[PDB]
Amino acid sequence: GLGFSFEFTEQQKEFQATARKFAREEIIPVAAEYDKTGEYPVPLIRRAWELGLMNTHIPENCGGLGLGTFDACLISEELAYGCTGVQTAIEGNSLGQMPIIIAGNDQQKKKYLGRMTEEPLMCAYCVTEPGAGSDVAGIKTKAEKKGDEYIINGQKMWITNGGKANWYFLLARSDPDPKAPANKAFTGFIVEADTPGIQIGRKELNMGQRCSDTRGIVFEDVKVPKENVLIGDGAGFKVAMGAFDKTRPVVAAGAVGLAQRALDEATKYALERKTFGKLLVEHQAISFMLAEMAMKVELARMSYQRAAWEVDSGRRNTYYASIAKAFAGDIANQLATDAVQILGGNGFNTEYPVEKLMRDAKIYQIYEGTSQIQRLIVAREHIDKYKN
Amino acid sequence: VRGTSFDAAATSGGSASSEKASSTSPVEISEWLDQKLTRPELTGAKVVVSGGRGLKSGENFKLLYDLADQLHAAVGASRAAVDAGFVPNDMQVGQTGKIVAPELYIAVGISGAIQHLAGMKDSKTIVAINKDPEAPIFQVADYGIVADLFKVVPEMTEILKKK
Numbered sequence: 068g069l070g071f072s073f074e075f076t077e078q079q080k081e082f083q084a085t086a087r088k089f090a091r092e093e094i095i096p097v098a099a100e101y102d103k104t105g106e107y108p109v110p111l112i113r114r115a116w117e118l119g120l121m122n123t124h125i126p127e128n129c130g131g132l133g134l135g136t137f138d139a140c141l142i143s144e145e146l147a148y149g150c151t152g153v154q155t156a157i158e159g160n161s162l163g164q165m166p167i168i169i170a171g172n173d174q175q176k177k178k179y180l181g182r183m184t185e186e187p188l189m190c191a192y193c194v195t196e197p198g199a200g201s202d203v204a205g206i207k208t209k210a211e212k213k214g215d216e217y218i219i220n221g222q223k224m225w226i227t228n229g230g231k232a233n234w235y236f237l238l239a240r241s242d243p244d245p246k247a248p249a250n251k252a253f254t255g256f257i258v259e260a261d262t263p264g265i266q267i268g269r270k271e272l273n274m275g276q277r278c279s280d281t282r283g284i285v286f287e288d289v290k291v292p293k294e295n296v297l298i299g300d301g302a303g304f305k306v307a308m309g310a311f312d313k314t315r316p317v318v319a320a321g322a323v324g325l326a327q328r329a330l331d332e333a334t335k336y337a338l339e340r341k342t343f344g345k346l347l348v349e350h351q352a353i354s355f356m357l358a359e360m361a362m363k364v365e366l367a368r369m370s371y372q373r374a375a376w377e378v379d380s381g382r383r384n385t386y387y388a389s390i391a392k393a394f395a396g397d398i399a400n401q402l403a404t405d406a407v408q409i410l411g412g413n414g415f416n417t418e419y420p421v422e423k424l425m426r427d428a429k430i431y432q433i434y435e436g437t438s439q440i441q442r443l444i445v446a447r448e449h450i451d452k453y454k455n
Numbered sequence: 456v457r458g459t460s461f462d463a464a465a466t467s468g469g470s471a472s473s474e475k476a477s478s479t480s481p482v483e484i485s486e487w488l489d490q491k492l493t494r495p496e497l498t499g500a501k502v503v504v505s506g507g508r509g510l511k512s513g514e515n516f517k518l519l520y521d522l523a524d525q526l527h528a529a530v531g532a533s534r535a536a537v538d539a540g541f542v543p544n545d546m547q548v549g550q551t552g553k554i555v556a557p558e559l560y561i562a563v564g565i566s567g568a569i570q571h572l573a574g575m576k577d578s579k580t581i582v583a584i585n586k587d588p589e590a591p592i593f594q595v596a597d598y599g600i601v602a603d604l605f606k607v608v609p610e611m612t613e614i615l616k617k618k
């Protein structure tokens with residue numbers, strides 16, 4: 068078309084400043100309290116909804132802004148810089164919404180996307196189980212069609228927003244034959260949280276992103292109306308799969324937000340703490356560390372930008388989103404521990420910002436597909452270019 | 456001879472002559488004095504019963520006691536039976552609860568999540584009564600049935616009132 072550009076649309080510079088002002092004036096001041104307590108950051112989530120920094124994938128005809136994946140990545144990077152726990156809670160909504168966006172009918176989208184437009188309701192992606200996370204195709208939550216309904220029996224694990232959600236996107240096993248393939252075995256549902264049979268578990272206690280609620284959910288005879296199935300019976304695995312193109316980059320942007328925070332912290336401090344007569348930054352080894360940290364962040368940023376640009380162009384971006392989530396997650400951990408390191412003893416201490424960033428970051432190599440899983444995807448995508 | 460390596464032969468069936476045995480002289484370097492015989496604490500025990508979420512209430516756990524007096528046995532549960540209000544916390548077998556490995560472990564209405572298997576895959580012998588047939592618990596159980604527990608369990612307490 069024209070050549071390359073690494074220049075934001077004016078409109079996107081505007082989205083950027085709003086998210087930043089929020090992240091910087093409202094999240095930063097309070098993230099360490101909410102991290103210390105695990106308190107679910109209700110004000111901030113309502114304030115981010117207020118500001119339209121939330122549910123941004125929802126198409127205009129369901130009352131949303133119908134923003135793209137690039138726009139959504141900008142905004143997350145900004146929120147994540149403030150806090151990943153908070154940004155994860157915001158973000159969950161998009162993950163729950165995404166299969167309904169990409170695969171829902173008009174009644175489904177209007178009904179369930181639309182309500183998100185008029186109150187700050189939450190929704191959740193209900194997939195992972197005690198026995199399967201990476202191997203989606205290993206989930207066993209039962210759905211049997213009995214009438215013009217389905218009856219859901221199963222237990223779900225590590226569900227972000229799981230006890231805060233108006234409804235769930237739920238993936239379940241439709242076909243009893245165990246030999247039934249993944250392309251036939253699974254069906255995706257929209258399930259309202261307040262259905263009888265549904266039991267929300269206790270708030271689960273993790274190293275990081277502690278203010279985010281992540282919860283077990285058990286379904287015991289859960290009644291689901293035929294009209295809440297996504298494309299039909301046996302389409303479940305494709306529908307869940309497809310959510311990732313539009314979402315991987317955004318979690319990658321999250322990892323980058325935290326990465327950038329770590330860098331900024333560690334830089335600020337290395338411009339005031341001195342040892343051996345000089346400032347930290349005059350010791351070459353420290354300087355080299357800041358340098359490599361800056362590389363790492365710039366490169367991660369381009370990586371997720373590229374993923375997001377690919378899907379906004381109407382291309383499937385599996386390969387590029389996987390590089391992003393692999394690279395962004397690996398370097399967010401790297402930058403976090405360095406940030407601690409550079410702050411020496413203070414960095415290990417809880418009244419300084421960085422230890423948290425280190426506890427926060429590890430989850431980026433686990434969820435929305437492990438570091439290893441991302442490499443398997445990248446490998447598979449890469450190698451197929453060479454099979455002829 | 457290990458008892459449960461063989462079958463009890465018929466208590467009636469054959470008829471057998473009975474002669475007076477040959478005699479011995481009392482030795483009297485030892486003498487018997489006394490005795491003391493005996494629902495155990497959970498961890499020390501050799502026979503554990505545990506109920507999952509499939510029992511549905513704490514008043515429903517009477518069926519598991521019913522049987523854990525026939526097997527002079529201990530009574531544990533999953534974390535999902537605890538959480539639902541059924542039982543207190545000191546009984547939860549599993550990863551966040553009491554790690555156990557006695558002779559006999561009965562899982563009743565337990566799906567068998569990796570976190571519960573971690574508290575007891577070292578039980579010598581493991582029983583699995585669970586109506587869903589693709590229930591993770593079956594792999595680790597030496598023995599089990601794809602059956603309603605309210606029919607199978609009160610039926611077991613009635614095959615050990617006599618034997």
Ligand SMILES: Cc1cc2nc3c(=O)[nH]c(=O)nc-3n(C[C@H](O)[C@H](O)[C@H](O)COP(=O)(O)OP(=O)(O)OC[C@H]3O[C@@H](n4cnc5c(N)ncnc54)[C@H](O)[C@@H]3O)c2cc1C
Nearest residue numbers: 192194195199200201225226227281433434435436437439
């Ligand atoms: C904080 C948190 C929030 C979460 N929120 C949600 C959410 O709301 N919705 C949801 O559905 N899930 C959620 N999850 C679940 C999460 O997505 C899964 O934990 C993750 O997808 C894979 O997790 P697992 O524990 O099952 O990994 P496992 O399958 O137990 O894998 C463990 C390790 O083995 C490696 N491995 C596994 N298989 C292979 C293989 N084939 N080849 C090479 N390596 C392999 C993995 O890389 C990993 O390192 C959340 C989890 C956490 C921790």
Ligand SMILES: Cc1cc2nc3c(=O)[nH]c(=O)nc-3n(C[C@H](O)[C@H](O)[C@H](O)COP(=O)(O)OP(=O)(O)OC[C@H]3O[C@@H](n4cnc5c(N)ncnc54)[C@H](O)[C@@H]3O)c2cc1C
Nearest residue numbers: 340341342343347350351352353408409410411412413415
């Ligand atoms: C849990 C804990 C327990 C402790 N217990 C004791 C104890 O019992 N007794 C005791 O005396 N101290 C103790 N300490 C203090 C600890 O020994 C020091 O933090 C450590 O020596 C590092 O010093 P610093 O924290 O002042 O960091 P700084 O000296 O400020 O160093 C800051 C960063 O810059 C780097 N740096 C500093 N100078 C250079 C340079 N010359 N070239 C390149 N890089 C440089 C450091 O490696 C670090 O990454 C403890 C600390 C902790 C965190």
Ligand SMILES: Cc1cc2nc3c(=O)[nH]c(=O)nc-3n(C[C@H](O)[C@H](O)[C@H](O)COP(=O)(O)OP(=O)(O)OC[C@H]3O[C@@H](n4cnc5c(N)ncnc54)[C@H](O)[C@@H]3O)c2cc1C
Nearest residue numbers: 507508509533534535549550551564565566568586587604
């Ligand atoms: C960090 C962490 C630690 C954990 N630690 C533990 C632990 O210490 N111990 C533990 O137990 N859990 C633990 N869990 C939870 C674990 O992952 C599962 O929630 C748990 O093992 C499942 O409990 P359950 O089998 O009783 O309930 P479910 O998994 O819901 O099992 C119910 C089963 O009962 C069956 N059923 C229902 N009705 C009947 C009927 N009447 N007849 C026969 N069968 C029936 C169903 O088919 C089903 O398979 C932990 C979770 C986390 C996240």
